[PDB]
Structure 1
């Protein structure tokens, strides 16, 4: 019954500091905020070979981080509406507004 969003960053602090400054914007004119609920941060892989032609066995692994970061707030006022849509940087997040 409150705002709910999903943040996806590929450097593991911007989720936290961005989450908290926008929380500051959010409780400035408002209150009743649920925190940065962690999600498992699923991964990826790319089994790449250390070669050009042959020697398939000598290989290596690039991968990826895909974090999800679930943040809410209840009891809206249109000023915490602006707390969502007032500050978004660093915008490497996959910011998605909902309710």
Structure 2
């Protein structure tokens, strides 16, 4: 019942925070609010120069945003409508079930 989503972009995880609670309320079912889970920041530090010019570093990040939505009353119309995930090809879905 623990539907969790991981996304690189915070906008598609906010949209994924919604749009599935709405297909949960499409049937008669109570769903827990989108739980803001701590994002995971991966930081990379590389030398800008192609050779020797150190102390000039370009820093890059990659934030994996996370959400938790819990269905509290799983009805049959929710397990059939659980495939209506409108994933923009970049939002990972993990339904614990």
Normalising by structure 2, we get a TM-score of: 0.88
CA contact (8 A) 1:22 1:83 kept: no
More strand per residue = 2
Question: How many residues are treated as equivalent by the alignment?
Answer: 97
Q: Structure 2 CA distance, aligned partners of 1:87 and 1:58?
A: 44
C-alpha contact (below 8 Å) 1:18/1:90 kept by paired residues: no
Consecutive unaligned residues in structure 1, runs of 5 or more: none
CA RMSD of aligned residues (A): 1.4
CA distance in 1, matches of 2:25, 2:86: 16
TM-score between both structures, scaled by the size of structure 1: 0.86
Moved over 6 A (4+): none
